[PDB]
């Protein structure tokens, strides 16, 4: 039978207008789906490295770590301290095996950096917004369904846009720019120039930008499942990060 094990991490970030990281949050889970014969016992091995918490004695350094961890009540932790192995007899269907959280710097660079340039004629109503997005993932790695949402001043309309590659889409809707970038890889640099008209009052507020995306074959924390072993079967072990709150001030 089939067994699915997914490490899934929700990333939230707040980045300042100068590019400084103000806040980073990772909420992670390890989710299982399986329908194994009676008797079955499963062992999951995680990154052998990894530390948990902020030890007052040892401190915390570079390396793979989470700030806190919690486990399903059915999980046996006899081999967790020595070997980072979890043991359980799963139910039929879905189970969340482990949850964890991280609020410190990530072990790799943040996946996206934005370089906005805004010129505002107070004036003639002319607003020019140039956005450059750089993907800082490894060059082999992909970001899927990337969308940038940018709230705009009340009553703004679009005069023109120039997008840096033809697969990109952008429109204004509900008072915000929505810019979709379906092709994004580590090292990509994608840009859009938007000419808008801002009406005078009857009769800012630009930003912040919020990115949403999925990062297949990736964890923000660096945590990984090393093995999945069954004792009595096709296995899928997947690692994914995603955000709907990757916020960047303009």
């Amino acid at each position: 039978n089939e067994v699915f094990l997914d490490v899934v991490e929700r990333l939230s970030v707040l980045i300042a207008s100068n590019g400084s990281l103000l806040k980073v949050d990772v909420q992670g889970e390890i989710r299982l789906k399986s329908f194994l014969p009676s008797g079955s016992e499963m062992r999951i091995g995680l990154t052998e490295e990894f530390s948990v918490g902020k030890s007052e004695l040892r401190g915390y350094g570079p390396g793979i770590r989470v700030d806190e961890v919690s486990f399903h009540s059915s999980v046996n932790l006899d081999e967790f301290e020595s070997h980072r192995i979890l043991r359980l007899q799963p139910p039929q269907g879905e189970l969340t095996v482990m949850r964890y959280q991280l609020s410190d710097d990530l072990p790799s660079p943040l996946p996206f950096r934005l370089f906005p340039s805004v010129q505002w004629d107070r004036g003639s109503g002319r607003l020019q917004v140039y956005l450059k997005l750089r993907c800082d993932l490894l060059s082999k790695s992909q970001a899927l369904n990337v969308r940038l949402h940018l709230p705009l001043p009340r009553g703004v309309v679009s005069l023109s846009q120039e997008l840096s590659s033809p697969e990109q889409k952008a429109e204004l809707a509900e008072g915000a720019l929505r810019w979709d970038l379906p092709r994004v890889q580590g090292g990509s640099q994608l840009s859009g120039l938007f000419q808008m008209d801002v009406p005078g009052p009857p009769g800012l507020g630009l930003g912040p930008a919020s990115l949403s995306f999925e990062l297949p074959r990736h964890t923000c924390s660096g945590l990984q499942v090393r093995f999945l072993r069954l004792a009595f079967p096709h296995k899928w072990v997947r690692h994914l990060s995603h955000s709907d709150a990757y916020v960047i001030r303009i």
Partner: peptide, 7 residues
Amino acid sequence: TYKFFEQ
């Protein structure tokens, strides 16, 4: 030592 949840 460890925190557990039921769901």
